[PDB]
Design a protein. Structure first.
Lengths: 520, 520, 75, 74
């Protein structure tokens, strides 16, 4: 059984924690629930850690007093089809392989599934670790509870004796790097300096051997990612988000200074010795838009190249951990600001951005966001009980599973079927424009080899490559973004028509240039 | 409350209406239900209209005495997925964009949804009005009752101050013209001369500014499209249909002179001054095949070009409003008869027809049509009630929703699952042949640029373009036709194999010609 | 098929019905829907019925214009 | 509230002209229209439970009244 420790004694040296702990709703929650500091207290001074105390990062540390939130979080949504590759005719991006050729996502890019699996899925996807990690067997793919208990309880490493990223199967890539893990887990929250910068007190950083880092990480989506364990108050911990919102002064709602001020973030820094080491962002309100924006954003979490001179931007560069914190129409400028692109298309040679699930930046300015609706309202609503204590569902999933709570309480004028029909109208229309955007991008892409071989000039090819960047951005945003337009249907529409416009411009340019070469 | 008017006084001048009204089942229905003629009666003579009386075109005019028919009509089938683009891998025509390139349907071609929405969907589709019209917001897409009450109750116009067709968003077209509206509404039934010919008494015609016309139109599928409001007897009002069946003497069943005589149409013309102005076609029987053929046919409703010399056929030409009234194997001849094609393929340059939902002409000769089965039997059957007055469902939808009434009363040997399985066998087989037809058409289409660039002669390209017309017709009929072969499975099969045969012939022709050029 | 009768002819002797019928929401609903009064009209006086007109009491007399109400009633 | 509100309410249609149901019957068959539009605080099962609480209690007193009437009669 746990025995409480003298918190007051801890506070003689931990005044920041004292100020958080004594004021919030965890004021009565003893440190022993999440720390083992016996040897630490015997050896520390206010200026010397002494023995490092243990800090529990497991979600069970919270589940004893918050079982409903834990259980609704770990629940597996079996209808969220697993390991479902998006590059197929029946999924999000039928022409993804042609369009993304040159990028690691060509090796595999599945639809998301339940949050319980985020860390294990990161480890086993074919693009991440060369196929080094697998579930112990194909049955373990069901075990959300096991994955939450710890990735290494359900995974195997093909070669525990080596730590290098390499291919273990031919059609894999080794795209994983330490920055990725920040959106899968925060088990390393005390071992990783802000942004993943080199730091004397950081075991891990952007430049770590990601296989070694991986082995040290266990739990998905730690409960403390959104809730300070000391104050119990709302926060974020993701460095790239705090960087965009606070360091870069972009605010929580870059398009709304008022809402940014009402629903803002306060950066709190923790030191190691005299030196700033890590930071959190306390939220003014329990704002799930910003909590979910820790991961559901477009980001760099990878090396890339400079737009200016094409040179490598490696993991050591701060730009390898970056939240652009920009809507689709501001993204190109945001990428130009940091002088960065992700990859060169394998066929066209164009410098291209790689977009990832920009749900947060898409949601801005949408009708629901402007009306003060937030991610949680549709994806983790309060539970409705005929008789019971209300709590907030932590099963973060499509509102189709809980339409009464997620939609119909607000939309009293609709039945469930009507609300689903409204969702489907948007997704159907958006998906048709995605598919047409791909058709046109693919038509352009296929002209590049013809053009090159016909002797079309580099100047014309470069003009087309510039158009490719735009056509790509304005399409990929929407295959990357998970709502298929629902989060901002007018923006999706405008962007995808822009994509098609750009591709058509490039097609015309190339066909005319090819035709002129032939005519010579 | 309505006050009845002296119908006998109206009849002193309206002898045609008298003959219809006094004999049918609306003999007791007073004019005041659908007309406000007070000032008209005070000012008219038998030879001068005087003040124009109001004629109600709203469906509510019928709904007071026929609520069941109205309510079953306005019902939204939410399972008829809305705004679902057909040019996608999971819909009717995965290669539609490549095959239809050059035509306005490339901008958007969704699957049909419930009849309540036909007018609003016509107005908001991306190919029609440059994106000028939108639903007031994305919630209104559910509101079938609102759309029936009036399009402009649920839509907005991006620029009420201008009336020209232009693009408001880049990836739109302005294909709509006044002829379209004849298959969406008949609110203009008193304002449109037969065929949309210029007429002194017509506010609207084929050559009208379609945006201005659009604003004057409100209701979908007026109840009087199939039912004369005066006699209550069965009719059609669509000019192009009466033209094909009566003016051109093709008959209601061009392949069956006997059935054409038993189930015929009598053209009734109404004058303005001394001049024929508009017409209806009274049906000998309540023949839904012909009622539904007012819209579910292949047609011209658009400008095109002449096959003979390639010259423009504009909206002013009668050919812009035309029911070919021909099965797929008679269509090429029917198009040659009026010297007409729709568009030139953007890649091949071939003159091509554009086919639209030829359900009526497909149904002819099929086993059900030969057995006297009609559209209504499968798509708007009598309701079966344990205790009640039977009426005819007006929810015109797939028989999958009412298999007992639509199929199984006739097919006593089958369970519902068996009948669905028989439907799916046909649609699966037909769809696989559609997909193969597209594969071969696409293969041919892709050879055109290669051939042109290899220096293949215009004569060879023109031979291939002639084959393209055939390959296209024999394929597109079936993506345009909504039953995926069910309405005439053997015809679909024969046509689609013909398409593939033609495409293969063209592929061989082009590959050989390209190979010969290279060998030189 | 029903042929309408001249209600004004009825109203000349049927003031109470006239006052009810002309004002309410059945003002346009002809008497023939529920009455066959041909011989009555030929034989009545202002105070004597003459031949008795037929009056339909069946619910179907209302079901043709109010099918939904009738069908929900008979279920 | 009147008899029709619970026993022949207006029909609820996603798309349609409203009319008054003339099927005069227990509200258990149409609780959404007959009870729950007014009693927004209840689910159907809660409303049914409230009906049954009354009916059960009342029927129990009817049975007891009969018991005592029968005892007197005998
Ligand atoms: C004698 C002063 C003192 C005492 C008392 C004290 N601490 Fe610490 N603690 C420190 C110092 C110094 C550090 C290192 C801070 C730094 O890195 O500069 C530290 C670090 C920590 C850490 C972070 C270790 C890491 O992984 O980086 C935790 C957790 C912690 N203390 C918990 C506690 C708990 C719980 C108690 C009471 C049971 C306690 N401490 C009492 C001085 C103290
Ligand atoms: C020993 C029991 C216990 C432990 C362990 C525990 N909590 Fe709590 N938590 C509480 C209590 C008690 C409250 C206050 C309940 C109330 O006042 O409504 C609370 C409140 C909260 C709140 C609501 C705070 C607010 O301001 O509304 C959150 C969020 C929360 N805890 C998160 C967590 C997290 C995350 C963990 C794991 C790091 C955790 N708790 C571990 C007991 C616990
Ligand atoms: C900014 C936070 C963030 C970063 C950093 C991040 N991810 Fe993700 N990842 C997400 C989110 C959110 C999803 C779920 C939404 C989706 O898949 O579109 C996801 C989904 C996934 C999935 C499951 C779906 C799929 O694509 O197969 C895998 C695997 C994955 N990430 C691997 C990685 C890899 C490998 C890296 C580093 C190269 C990485 N992630 C970095 C946020 C992040
Ligand atoms: C992605 C951010 C996020 C994560 C991670 C998270 N929560 Fe929450 N949590 C929320 C939100 C949003 C609320 C509702 C806040 C509000 O509306 O007041 C909430 C509310 C709570 C509450 C307050 C009581 C309630 O249910 O409303 C508790 C306790 C809680 N969470 C516990 C946990 C536990 C335990 C975990 C780990 C299993 C967890 N949370 C993980 C976002 C998160
Ligand atoms: C907290 C209240 C609330 C929630 C929950 C809610 N809505 Fe809304 N929704 C609104 C409001 C307010 C509007 C704007 C209404 C207006 O301006 O007329 C709106 C607008 C919409 C629109 C127009 C969308 C656009 O971006 O233009 C759609 C579609 C819609 N809602 C569907 C849904 C769906 C489906 C759900 C559940 C996933 C949902 N709503 C949940 C309040 C809500
Ligand atoms: C004094 C003769 C006369 C009387 C009586 C008469 N009408 Fe007319 N009505 C006309 C004439 C003339 C026209 C125009 C025909 C033409 O265009 O040549 C016309 C046209 C119409 C139209 C078509 C208007 C249009 O939009 O084109 C309607 C409807 C109509 N009448 C209804 C009625 C009704 C109902 C009554 C009885 C309440 C009535 N009329 C009585 C002479 C008459
Ligand atoms: C004031 C009531 C009323 C109005 C308004 C009304 N109808 Fe009728 N309708 C009738 C009656 C009464 C019948 C005959 C019922 C019977 O005899 O079976 C009828 C019969 C019909 C029939 C059956 C005719 C046949 O020969 O079988 C059709 C079709 C019809 N109406 C269509 C309509 C249309 C379309 C409208 C709107 C333009 C309309 N009605 C408006 C009362 C009305
Ligand atoms: C006035 C022209 C017109 C008439 C007459 C007509 N239709 Fe339609 N039909 C349409 C249009 C337009 C649509 C597509 C509506 C939309 O997408 O908004 C459609 C759609 C349909 C659908 C698809 C409905 C769904 O659930 O998706 C069916 C089935 C159908 N029609 C059958 C029929 C039948 C059977 C008849 C004869 C009883 C008929 N139609 C008469 C124009 C017409
Ligand atoms: C001969 C009658 C007729 C003509 C004229 C007509 N339509 Fe249609 N339309 C239909 C029918 C029937 C459907 C439903 C069956 C289908 O979509 O295949 C339909 C469906 C539609 C739809 C919904 C499905 C889609 O394609 O997105 C739209 C939008 C539409 N039409 C627009 C137009 C436009 C624009 C015009 C004129 C350029 C036009 N229609 C002319 C009969 C017609
Ligand atoms: C596309 C043609 C079409 C349209 C438009 C149409 N109907 Fe019908 N209607 C039919 C057919 C077919 C029948 C059945 C005729 C038969 O089999 O005897 C029918 C029958 C009827 C009847 C006779 C009673 C019955 O139900 O069989 C009435 C009344 C009627 N319709 C009213 C309306 C109303 C009111 C509207 C407008 C909401 C409407 N109709 C629109 C085709 C149509
Ligand atoms: C009014 C009666 C009737 C209706 C309703 C009916 N059928 Fe038929 N069906 C027939 C008859 C008669 C045949 C020819 C039987 C024979 O010749 O042996 C037939 C033939 C068929 C065939 C062979 C088709 C072909 O074109 O070669 C299929 C499949 C079929 N029916 C399925 C259905 C389905 C599914 C439905 C409901 C959508 C349906 N039928 C509704 C009477 C009907
Ligand atoms: C020839 C068609 C017809 C006949 C037959 C008919 N009604 Fe009506 N009834 C109407 C019309 C038209 C209205 C007015 C609809 C409106 O304005 O909303 C009406 C309205 C009504 C109303 C609504 C009155 C109000 O003040 O709101 C009732 C109740 C009604 N009728 C009952 C009956 C009864 C009972 C019968 C049989 C004795 C009957 N009707 C027969 C056509 C008819
Ligand atoms: C506030 C709603 C309400 C009102 C108003 C109401 N009732 Fe009831 N009625 C009920 C309920 C609840 C029952 C029990 C039904 C059951 O248990 O299935 C009932 C039972 C009945 C029953 C027996 C039903 C059956 O199927 O056994 C009759 C008859 C009845 N009521 C008639 C009336 C009359 C007449 C009126 C107006 C004087 C009236 N009710 C008003 C709610 C209502
Ligand atoms: C026991 C009394 C009663 C009987 C008998 C009755 N009704 Fe009604 N009726 C009502 C009531 C109550 C309403 C709703 C009045 C209100 O709330 O405005 C109504 C409304 C109506 C309306 C107006 C439209 C609507 O639906 O609200 C019509 C039409 C009507 N009834 C027709 C009929 C028909 C036809 C019959 C015979 C099948 C019938 N009624 C028998 C009580 C009755
Ligand atoms: O691939 N994780 O965005
Ligand atoms: O596009 N209407 O056939
Ligand atoms: Ca990115
Ligand atoms: Ca056509």
């Amino acid at each position: 059984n746990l025995k409480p420790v003298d918190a007051m004694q801890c506070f003689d040296c931990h005044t920041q924690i004292e100020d958080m702990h004594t004021v919030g709703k965890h004021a009565t929650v003893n440190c022993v629930h999440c720390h083992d500091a016996t040897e630490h207290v015997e050896t520390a001074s206010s200026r010397r850690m002494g023995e490092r105390p243990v800090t529990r990062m497991d979600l069970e540390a919270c589940a004893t007093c918050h079982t409903a939130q834990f259980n609704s979080f770990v629940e597996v949504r079996h209808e969220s089809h697993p390991r479902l590759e998006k590059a197929t005719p029946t999924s999000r991006s039928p022409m993804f392989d042609k369009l993304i050729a040159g990028h690691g996502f060509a090796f595999e890019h599945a639809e998301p599934r339940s949050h319980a699996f985020m860390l294990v899925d990161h480890f086993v996807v074919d693009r991440a670790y060369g196929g080094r990690f697998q579930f112990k067997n194909w049955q373990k793919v069901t075990d959300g509870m096991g994955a939450v208990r710890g990735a290494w309880t359900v995974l195997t490493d093909a070669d525990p004796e080596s730590s290098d990223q390499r291919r273990f199967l031919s059609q894999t890539a080794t795209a994983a790097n330490p920055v990725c893990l920040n959106c899968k887990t925060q088990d390393h929250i005390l071992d990783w300096a802000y942004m993943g910068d080199e730091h004397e007190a950081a075991k891990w950083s952007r430049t770590s051997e990601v296989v070694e880092f991986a082995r040290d990480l266990n739990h998905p989506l730690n409960c403390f990612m959104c809730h300070d364990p000391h104050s119990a108050g709302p926060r974020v911990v993701r460095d790239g988000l705090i960087n965009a919102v606070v360091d870069r002064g972009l605010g929580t709602y870059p398009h709304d200074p008022v809402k940014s001020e009402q629903q803002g973030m306060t950066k709190v820094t923790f030191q190691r010795g005299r030196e700033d080491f890590r930071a959190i962002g306390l939220l003014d309100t329990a704002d799930s838009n910003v909590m979910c924006a820790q991961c559901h954003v477009e980001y760099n979490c990878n090396p890339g190249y400079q737009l200016s001179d094409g040179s490598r931007v490696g993991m050591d560069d701060r730009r390898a951990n970056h939240f652009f914190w920009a809507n689709v129409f501001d993204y190109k400028e945001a990428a130009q600001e940091i002088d960065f692109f992700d990859f060169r298309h394998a066929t066209t040679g164009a410098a291209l951005p790689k977009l990832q699930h920009p749900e947060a930046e898409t949601f801005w300015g949408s009708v629901h966001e402007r009306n003060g609706v937030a991610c949680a309202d549709c994806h983790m609503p309060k539970v409705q009980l005929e008789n019971g204590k209300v709590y907030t569902s932590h099963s973060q999933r499509t509102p189709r599973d809980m339409m009464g709570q997620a939609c119909l309480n607000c939309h009293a004028e609709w039945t469930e079927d009507q609300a689903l029909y409204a969702i489907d109208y948007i997704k159907n229309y958006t998906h048709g424009k995605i598919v047409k955007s791909e058709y046109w991008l693919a038509k352009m892409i296929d002209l590049f080899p013809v053009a090159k071989r016909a002797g079309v000039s580099e100047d014309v090819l470069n003009q087309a490559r510039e158009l490719h960047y735009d056509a790509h951005l304005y399409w990929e945003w929407w295959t990357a973004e998970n709502s298929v337009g629902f989060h901002n249907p007018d923006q999706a529409r405008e962007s995808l028509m822009t994509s098609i416009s750009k591709s058509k411009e490039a097609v015309s340019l190339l066909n005319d240039a090819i035709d002129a070469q032939v005519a010579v």
